[PDB]
Amino acid sequence: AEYQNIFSQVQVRGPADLGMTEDVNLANRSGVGPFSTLLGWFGNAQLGPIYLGSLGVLSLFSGLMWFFTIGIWFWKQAGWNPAVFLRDLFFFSLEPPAPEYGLSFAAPLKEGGLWLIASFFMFVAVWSWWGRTYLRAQALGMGKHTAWAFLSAIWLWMVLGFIRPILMGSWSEAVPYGIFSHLDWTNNFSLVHGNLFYNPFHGLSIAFLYGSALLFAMHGATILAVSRFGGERELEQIADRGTAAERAALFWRWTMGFNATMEGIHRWAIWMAVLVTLTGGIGILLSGTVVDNWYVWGQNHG
């Protein structure tokens, strides 16, 4: 065979890397955790350090709370019997307040009040974690691409359980925390709105989702294909183009008439993906509020 570079033939280790400093408060970075020969076969072997700091704790905490709030309810349902728990694990579920309670925060625990709490934690954990990704960027003088991308995802998440339920009128419209539970919600949403396929944004979203796998599959293989010219070192090839960047571009040019640059391809990459939850967010937001049946709508568009 001719080495395919999916795995390293030989690993090499050196001292733990404490990482670049810049305006980072080193008082917050944890300690260089162990190494891992396992991971080191596919990618990096060094585990840690992690920059905790204030905000990180808030989320990490605010996050576990949300997680437990639910685990508890499951037990309540499991009858505290551990065998029941394990068995009906995928079946349990914490649903939101009944339609009656509308958008009030009065519903009692066993009526959606518990869901409201858990949700609260979730809402904090995520948003706080979002600022964290913006600051970690800032402390290193890097662009905020990562924060803006993570935002597109928050968009949809924010629509599925916070915006649409508010435009509808009740906490009923949101998603229930549960494995099989939230799968049915989905199947249902579709049926109730007249088959989501007829929803244009939905068909669009799928398009990008498929695009992401198409693109990453393309980008990934290319780089490994020209890794024999140190292709994976993208940033430098952007600063000073090499054969790796030329052969990479030409392979596509000759195949499909056009191509990209070592800095452009990543621009396609970030947009292809981002649009998936950008377009989807819209489609779900209109469903129920403006449009009621996509089939019917698909008939006249008014």
Binding site: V10, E236, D240, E246, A260, G264
Partner: protein, 236 residues
């Protein structure tokens, strides 16, 4: 209705996005050219983008694209047909002339630097703290080639300090000199390292480096381009 309206908006947006995107990928390689090196007439519907500048770190200067494209090297090739679109045969030794699969770019003749300004790659000996932490250790192994004969022996492993990666294998040849081989181009085995692209006699041809304690972007390209070409050219 909003829906009907939200969608046209979107397409119009999507069109601007693609526009922006395509032009951005035209920052290198453009304007198009004719087989003779002169500006081609048809350049596509997309215009070139306003240039942008990169402030390279370590005061290595700046970079602005799009910019003046110059191969900055002779290309030993010659037409094979009187029309456009046909191959261009190598007038000399493809491997030596560095054309085709043996090509290489005239990149800066400086080494890439880790975020601290130090050389990104160094032979393991000069790397304090580094060692082979898993897999067969090649230092000491005899190198074999396309032709199944002996070409040399590994005498060290050049490594990427910041990314802790094996990138090259320093191989000592018969005349006592060393060369570098791309990690991604050798098959390491219990008792020997195998090299398919090249055959023994071609090993000596591998471009050599100046400093014995570092490689420059230009040298990496000449070394790699060369080895990669052997695949097609080693043939005989």
């Amino acid at each position: 209705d909003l829906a009907s309206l939200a969608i046209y908006s979107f397409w119009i947006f999507l069109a601007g996005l693609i526009y922006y995107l395509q032009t951005e990928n035209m920052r290198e390689g453009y304007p198009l050219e004719n087989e003779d090196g002169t500006p081609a007439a048809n350049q596509g519907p997309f215009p070139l983008p306003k240039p942008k500048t990169f402030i390279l770190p370590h005061g290595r200067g700046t970079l602005t694209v799009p910019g003046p494209e110059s191969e900055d090297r002779p290309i030993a090739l010659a037409r094979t047909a009187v029309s456009e679109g046909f191959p261009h045969a190598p007038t000399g030794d493809p491997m030596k002339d560095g054309v085709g699969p043996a090509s290489w770019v005239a990149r800066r003749d400086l080494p890439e630097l880790d975020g601290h300004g130090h050389n990104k790659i160094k032979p393991m000996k000069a790397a304090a703290g580094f060692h082979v932490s898993a897999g067969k250790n090649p230092i000491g192994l005899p190198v074999r080639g396309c032709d199944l004969e002996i070409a040399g022996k590994v005498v060290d492993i050049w490594v990427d300090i910041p990314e802790q990666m094996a990138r090259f294998l320093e191989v000592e040849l018969k005349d006592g000199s060393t060369r570098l081989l791309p990690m991604q181009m050798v098959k390491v085995q219990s008792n020997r390292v195998h090299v398919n692209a090249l055959s023994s006699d071609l090993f000596a041809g591998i471009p050599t480096i100046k400093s014995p304690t570092e490689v420059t972007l230009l040298e990496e390209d000449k070394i790699c381009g060369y080895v990669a070409g052997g695949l097609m050219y080693a043939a005989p």
